[PDB]
Design brief:
The structure is cut from a larger assembly and holds one copy of chain A (199 residues), two copies of chain B, one copy of chain D (112 residues) and one copy of chain E (290 residues). Chain A has 199 residues and is α+β, with helices and mostly antiparallel strands. Helices cover 48% and strands 8% of the residues of chain A. Chain A has a four-stranded mixed sheet, sandwiched between helices. In chain A, α3 packs antiparallel against α8. Chain A is globular, with a radius of gyration of 22 Å. The two termini of chain A are 35 Å apart. Chain B is elongated and about 80 Å long. Chain E has one domain (43-290). Chain E is built from ten helices and ten strands. In chain E, strands 6-4-5-9 form a four-stranded antiparallel sheet, with no helix packed on it. A three-stranded mixed sheet of chain E has the order 3-2-10, with no helix packed on it. A two-stranded antiparallel sheet of chain E has the order 7-8. The longest helix of chain E has 29 residues, at 47-75. Chain E starts with a strand and ends with a helix. The chains are: A alpha+beta (199), B alpha/beta (158), D alpha+beta (112), E alpha+beta (290). Chains B and C meet through α1 and α2 of B and β1 and β2 of C. β1 of chain D pairs antiparallel with β1 (3-9) of chain E. Chain A binds two RNA strands through α1, α3 and α7. Chain E: One of its GO terms (biological process) is ribosomal large subunit biogenesis. Chain E: It comes from Saccharomyces cerevisiae (strain ATCC 204508 / S288c).
Chain lengths: 199, 158, 87, 112, 290
Amino acid sequence: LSRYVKWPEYVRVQRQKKILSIRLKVPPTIAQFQYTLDRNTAAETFKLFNKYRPETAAEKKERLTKEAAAVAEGASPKPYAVKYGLNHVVALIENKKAKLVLIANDVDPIELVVFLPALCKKMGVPYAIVKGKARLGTLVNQKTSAVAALTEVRAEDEAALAKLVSTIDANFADKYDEVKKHWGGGILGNKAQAKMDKR
Amino acid sequence: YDSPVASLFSAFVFYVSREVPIDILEFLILSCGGNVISEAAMDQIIDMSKVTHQIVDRPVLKNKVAGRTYIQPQWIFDCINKGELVPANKYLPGEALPPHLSPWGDAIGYDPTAPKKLKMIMMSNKQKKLYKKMKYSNAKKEEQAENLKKKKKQIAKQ
Amino acid sequence: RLVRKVFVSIKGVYYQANIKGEEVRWLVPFKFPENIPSDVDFRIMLTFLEFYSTLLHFVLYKLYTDSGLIYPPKLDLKKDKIISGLS
Amino acid sequence: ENYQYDLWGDSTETNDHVMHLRAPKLPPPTNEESYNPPEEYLLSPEEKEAWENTEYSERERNFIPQKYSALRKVPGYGESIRERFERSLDLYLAPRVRKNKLNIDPNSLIPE
Amino acid sequence: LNSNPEILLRKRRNADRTRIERQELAKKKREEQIKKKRSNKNKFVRAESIVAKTLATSREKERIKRVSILEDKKAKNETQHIASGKDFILKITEGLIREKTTYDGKPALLFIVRVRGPLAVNIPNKAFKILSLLRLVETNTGVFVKLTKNVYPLLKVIAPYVVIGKPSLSSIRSLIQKRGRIIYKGENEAEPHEIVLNDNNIVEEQLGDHGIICVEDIIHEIATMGESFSVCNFFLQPFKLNREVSGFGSLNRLRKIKQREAESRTRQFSNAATAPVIEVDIDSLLAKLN
RNA sequence: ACCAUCGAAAGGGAAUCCUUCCGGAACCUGGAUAUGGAUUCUUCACACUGAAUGUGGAGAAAAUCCACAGGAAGGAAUAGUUUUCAUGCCAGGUCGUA
RNA sequence: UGAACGCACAUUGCGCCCCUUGGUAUUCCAGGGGGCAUGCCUGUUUGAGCGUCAUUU
């Protein structure tokens, strides 16, 4: 018969792209984004980054209205928050101000972030490819965020950020720096590995 | 006020004991015109001056001070339904209560407190069926009444 | 002082009162611990209670204000700590 | 101010529509339901087992009468939540039908 | 034909079968919940859980050792090199005020509620023994105790695991009349059924010799500590209370957040040997838990 | 499971005669309902319940009507269930008409 | 009627939704009023997809 009618076209194309993702031989610059932080390092990174979440619109408005109401009747330290926005973070990286840069691995126009690991390594800025662009937006109060960064940290968490940077250097940089520059995606299916690898 | 029930227990002060439920008895006493001095209300962190009655539920009483009238709860339950302050002799601590009948009577009209076939041929089919249903219903009612009467007689045998 | 009839049964106590020329009969269970069966669906009883609570709120306001009483009645916190009933 | 005003006021409006069917209250309790009924109302063990084996929707009476010699001896009713639940289920799941219940005596059907 | 108009409600269709199906479904849900609950003890244990348990239990053990040494020093009247020799009681009441008062020798009535203790803490031997003799191991469970000069040092050992205070007469009455349990024999053989106090016949059978013939006599012997206080206190068995917030939906999750946020201000524990026994308003808490 | 709709005043098609008005007389379709009888000891007969599902006849490509297998569900004590049995009530618009 | 908009149209044919009124009227009939085209944009609400993820105190 014609059983294809059990999938709409968008579902079928959506799964065909998934198959093509693992069957095609992807170049190293696009292949490196499959190597991300593991469970423990990613869980520890988001514990530090969730303590410097920027104020939402409502909280900032309330804080400003309290000051306004105080003034209407009759010396603060610099704030701390996670830096986001692609242009802002890229400008921070090339000025050597970012202490740690998280790069999402699922940016749909992937060319928006392909240069970012190379720029971070060239400029001597610690970086980590983190699985999930929607998870970087939670600590930014946006639906998605391509990147996130930490420029300044409170003196209580200075040791934690250094330890996290060392952990990422040992687990992510020094571990993948040889396989990062190899073509990926040459996964063979069973019906194909049975007839090529065996024969 | 407009009813005798609202005037009962007017010049009465009841001493509600611990055994009797205060929730369902203070409401009944107050709704008639009485006053309640609950015994269960002196357990937190009076001395019974004007009390004229006492509702008890123990098998045996202890004090029995003169002047007061000692009653079982059913007296109140029977003083409201009649509305005429029935005698308290039958409601005393330690004896058997009267059978406390329902204010709305019995389902089949049985009173507990008490001492054609040739013409049917011409009936139609549906009329005959209706008549037989009615006779069956009446017979079942009378049989249910007679069973209760027989059980009462057997109980009164011993 | 509107109570007209009372009947103590094995299920609870039936009270019949005279509210505005109508006979109102309600059942109050005995104050004993309850055994809740898992069979019943409280999802329906909660909606029924939600409707009935508002019905009583309005009816009680009307009844209190027709008789000149103040509504809602003031709760005596000192007498509520001993018995906590109608008194 | 939630529910703190007069809803009905002085209105005497009626809802007497042809398809307004009101639930016919609930039958009043009888003598056998009392906490201290006359002795003849108690069920025999055979009748008790007959009631016990009957289906819950086929029982003519939803309880077994009991006699208590004192008010303090009365136990808390067990099937108290279930009765209210069944009443509320009937209040919106049971079809309501108008009917003209007969009230004649049988002897009037006999031909003259 | 001499009829009388009325409204008739037709019988509901298939009510008994639905009742049986619902009973079976409830039983099946309970059984599968038990299955999944005891099937989750074989899951992988991460290192951080073990380290946290060890650290927190080590801290709690030192707390208990300090409290026990201080109470031993006070008991022997060796109060020379101790921090403080006074039995303090802190009363917290809700805009939240604190009363720091010296405890008398006068006996009092307390209702101790078993709450969940500090996180990542295994209960040490001393605290578990005290809670076991109090029949307080199940959380969300309360017991009536008579506070005296010797009970006081016990309350300083099990302080993080319980919440204490003096109940009123209305609280006692409502608690006994809504949650009353007894270990009573079943039909012929099965003893350990835990049933509710529905009738005074069982109370008269069990406690009738002491003169207790009804539940309201248990209420009297508990509200006022009488000669038969212990007999009825160990007859009622610990009360099964209701947890404040029960659920994990978004509304219930934020209720839990708000409830925990207020717990940092009501049940405070100083982790010190001379910590006062914290007493709270039990009437309001039982209003929440009843 | 499978595609809107259009396409016939000579094809298929519910019903009027002595074809529309008048007099008399008669049919068709749709609907709500009441009465009698049947459903025979109390529960679908020797009128005479019948869901999903699957077929046959008439039309004869389709509209339209009927029937058959099937066994879901329902039916009793002051009107049990059905009403392909009989009688009783109401209505029938638009365009053409010499 | 016409770009012409409920569907058709060589017919002055056939429908659906909401409110309201009148005749024996809860069911039937009729009258009155207001709506029902397509492409696209912004927003609201309701969804589909083993598409990518996170998910032990």
